Design a protein around this ligand. Structure first.
Ligand SMILES: [Zn+2]
Ligand SMILES: [Zn+2]
Ligand SMILES: [Zn+2]
Lengths: 103, 129, 98, 171, 86
């Protein structure tokens, strides 16, 4: 929980166990405290690089979904452009051999 | 408090008619004609010249009936009086740019119908003067 | 006694959050000559285009900060981490009651 | 935002300023009084459209002037929290950017400015240019910002803005 | 329309009272003293109390008496519709 770090406020996880955490598109985890604290100071920029955040692309949740950063990125990359490939490949393949390349 | 992102408007500015740049510039142009073709004896002020120049600097329309046509297509949908002027005065280009200016627009209708709405706005947009 | 201890823990945790939230939003301009606390909503009238700096109202003096003691852009981290120090000193007492 | 509602204000006329047409004297004085001012409830009155109805003459003791409850419809300007409009850069300072939207003055703090557009005090004209010199935002430029907090004051209303938002710059 | 009812039925006799004569003579004297157009023709006088008295006999003073009723309504009266009493 507190081992992944915190961007701006840095003092929020130690104040409330049932904290509402959010995610973005580049691949970070920002709680609800960093959303309002960064908007009154700047806007929607990535604390590490430069990722613009205009639309409401935040997924609010209080169950602590992003546990491991490795298993949360593979679930978003498949349900984006790889989920649409589940129909085009069966229209040309003939054996279970090319499906191992997608995995 | 008042908030334009969540449509938090008071009881006085809830059902008020909004105006854009070319509309105010048109009404202020009639006041200029009353000073050139009549003049009377009283002189105006510099504030009227600065306001008239600022409206024409950001204006994008010309004809009178053309402006009222833009505020017509942006009303039949589930929108608001504030969201109507933001999509008519600024004249958005793409469908994704419209939602970037209004936070309360993403939680409405899809972008399939919004693309056809902006087609009429860009058609009547005066590219040159 | 079980609920009385938990009653004070909710007010002691919110007292630091209230005193910190009511201290970051105040001011950030003060003249070191006339000792006048200015705000950020008056920068359009306290500016002089012939010098590029800020001035005052009834006098022509240069302003500075606003007494560095409030949680500013950099001093907020020093005061925010003080609330996290309550967890290690009370973890032996909170884990037992939980 | 430019609105169009009905306004009601008590106009005082001097007893000597009557003339032949009494209705024409009150109308000519209305345009040279309510215009250019601003209120905390209606907004910045620019000009009066069409005169609606004109009341009678109310006379009160101890006040020799005459009052006419003239009802009209004038345009106003009341900014709200969250409006995205364009601005014109007037002054550029190392502390913050000074922009103005017509008769309204704005303000952009330093923390709302990206680190790429850093202030360069070397050259004489102040501007906010990037490291690779891509865009240059100097005096008298058409930019875009978002209103953060509004404030009314006699006539010159205040409305702080931000620049860190996306889809801004020279439009 | 919900309060002024002077264009239908009037109950008070059309006659000027001693209270209305004092206000008309006092209000008109203050207006003329502040440079006001004389309704009648001046013959050569400078007393402000006499100018307003001469205009009262000529019933040319453009004022309307608004008598507020104690119930909540009010009635209107003119100079020509009220005969002065001396
Ligand atoms: Zn945080
Ligand atoms: Zn990043
Ligand atoms: Zn000073």
């Amino acid at each position: 929980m507190d081992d992944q770090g915190c961007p701006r406020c840095k003092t929020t996880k130690y104040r409330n166990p049932s904290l509402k955490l959010m995610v973005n598109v580049c691949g970070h985890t920002l709680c609800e405290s960093c959303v309002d604290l960064l908007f009154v100071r700047g806007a929607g920029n990535c604390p590490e690089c430069g990722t613009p955040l205009r639309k409401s692309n935040f997924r609010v949740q209080l169950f602590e979904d992003p546990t491991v950063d490795k298993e949360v990125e593979i679930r978003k990359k498949v349900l984006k452009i790889y989920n649409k490939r589940e129909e085009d490949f069966p229209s040309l393949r003939e054996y279970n051999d090319f499906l191992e390349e997608v995995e | 408090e008042e908030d334009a992102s969540q449509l938090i408007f008071p009881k006085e500015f809830e059902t008020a008619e909004t105006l854009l740049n070319s509309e105010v510039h048109m009404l202020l142009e009639h006041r200029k004609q009353q000073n050139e073709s009549a003049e009377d004896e009283q002189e105006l002020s510099e504030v009227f010249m600065k306001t008239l120049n600022y409206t024409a600097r950001f204006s994008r329309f010309k004809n009178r009936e053309t402006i009222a046509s833009v505020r017509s297509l942006l009303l039949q949908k589930k929108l608001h009086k504030f969201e109507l002027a933001c999509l008519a005065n600024l004249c958005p280009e793409t469908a994704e740019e419209s939602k970037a200016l209004i936070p309360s627009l993403e939680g409405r209708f899809e972008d399939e119908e919004l693309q056809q709405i902006l087609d009429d706005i860009q058609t009547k947009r005066s590219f040159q003067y | 006694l079980v609920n009385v201890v938990k009653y004070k823990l909710d007010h002691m945790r919110r007292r630091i959050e209230t005193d910190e939230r009511d201290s970051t939003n105040r001011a950030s301009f003060k003249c070191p000559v006339c000792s006048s606390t200015f705000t950020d909503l008056e920068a359009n009238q306290l500016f002089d285009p012939m010098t590029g700096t800020f001035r005052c109202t009834f006098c022509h003096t240069e302003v500075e900060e606003d007494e560095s003691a409030m949680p500013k852009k950099d001093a907020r981290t020093l005061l925010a981490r003080f609330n996290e120090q309550i967890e290690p000193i009370y973890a032996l007492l909170r884990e037992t009651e939980d | 935002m430019f609105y169009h509602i009905s306004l009601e204000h008590e106009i005082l006329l001097h007893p000597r300023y009557f003339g032949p047409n009494l209705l024409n004297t009150v109308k000519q004085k209305l345009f040279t009084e309510v215009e250019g001012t601003c209120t905390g409830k209606y907004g910045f009155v620019i000009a009066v459209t069409t005169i609606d109805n004109i009341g009678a003459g109310v006379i009160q003791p101890g006040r020799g002037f005459v009052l006419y409850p003239v009802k009209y419809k004038a345009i106003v300007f009341r900014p709200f929290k969250g409006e995205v409009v364009d601005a014109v850069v007037t002054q550029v300072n190392k502390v913050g950017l000074f922009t103005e939207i017509g008769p309204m003055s704005c303000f952009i703090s330093r923390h709302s400015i990206p680190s790429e557009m850093e202030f360069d005090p070397n050259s004489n004209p102040p501007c906010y240019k990037t490291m690779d010199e891509d865009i240059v935002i100097q005096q008298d430029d058409e930019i875009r910002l978002k209103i953060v907090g509004t404030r009314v004051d006699k006539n010159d209303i205040f409305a702080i803005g931000s620049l860190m938002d996306d889809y801004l710059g020279l439009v | 329309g919900e309060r002024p009812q002077a264009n239908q039925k009037r109950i008070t006799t059309p006659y000027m009272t001693k209270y209305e004569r004092a206000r008309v003579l006092g209000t008109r004297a203050l207006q003329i003293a502040m440079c006001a157009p004389v309704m009648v023709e001046l013959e050569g006088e400078t007393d402000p109390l006499l100018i307003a008295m001469k205009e009262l006999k000529a019933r040319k003073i453009p004022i309307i008496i608004r008598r507020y009723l104690p119930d909540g309504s009010y009635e209107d009266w003119g100079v020509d519709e009220l005969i002065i009493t001396d």
